[PDB]
Amino acid sequence: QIVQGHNQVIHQYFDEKNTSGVLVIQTDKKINLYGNALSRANTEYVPASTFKMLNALIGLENQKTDINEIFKWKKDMTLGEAMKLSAVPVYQELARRIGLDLMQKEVKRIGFGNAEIGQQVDNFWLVGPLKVTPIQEVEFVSQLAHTQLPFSEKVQANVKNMLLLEESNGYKIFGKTGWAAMDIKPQVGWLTGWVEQPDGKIVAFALNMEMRSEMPASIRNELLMKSLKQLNII
């Protein structure tokens, strides 16, 4: 922390997509950088739907919802079902219950990115003013994985359970995508999360790249999996 890793092959993965990207990896207390645009690692970007992790923690901690509540499609969904889908009404609904005031206090207490939420409680993560670096994101998700955020242990466990993405060969991959696509240029794509390896060890990641509208949403996962293989993390 914080050093370029062995980055030969991974830089070429990003080059092949004709876009700039970084992958930050945090093991215990040590952070390595990979990709073709390493300066992105300490550049601030809007978090986009990666903020849903923190919205859920704040909402659950403050009893503004619970994991069994059904949000009406006015499909009907729980908070957890909505985590992995596009569900801005649901997370937007939650943000309104929290309210601008409690949201700003919580974001300040956690110290997430620039910790600015402005005056519009239901879109500050999508269009600004809140911004965060990929290094900060990996640090945040590492803390969540290890139950070290200053929230209830049970709330952290319940949000972690919402983030399982894919699993294979005894490895579990947890995380959250984001894509700030509308109202923001250049577009920014996130995939932030962690690997739990078969013996229990945790390796956290934050992928951050420039997106274009013609890209498939799976490009983030594709680049992540290739890179984690190269690094022997999976």
Annotated binding site for a beta-lactam: 49, 52, 86, 177, 179, 220
Q: Which of 20, 49, 168, 227 is catalytic?
A: 49
CB of 188 to Na ion, least distance (A): 5
The rounded distance, in Å, linking the Cα atoms of 182 and 141 is 25
C-beta neighbour count of 229 within 10 angstroms? 11
**Where along the sequence are the contacts to Na ion (CB under 5 A)?**
45-46, 69-70, 88, 91, 218, 221-222, 229
The rounded distance, in Å, linking the Cα atoms of 86 and 52 is 11
| Whether residue 49 lies in the annotated active site | yes
Q: What angle do CA 162, 172, 195 make, to 5 degrees?
A: 95
The rounded distance, in Å, linking the Cα atoms of 44 and 101 is 23
Residues classed as catalytic: 49
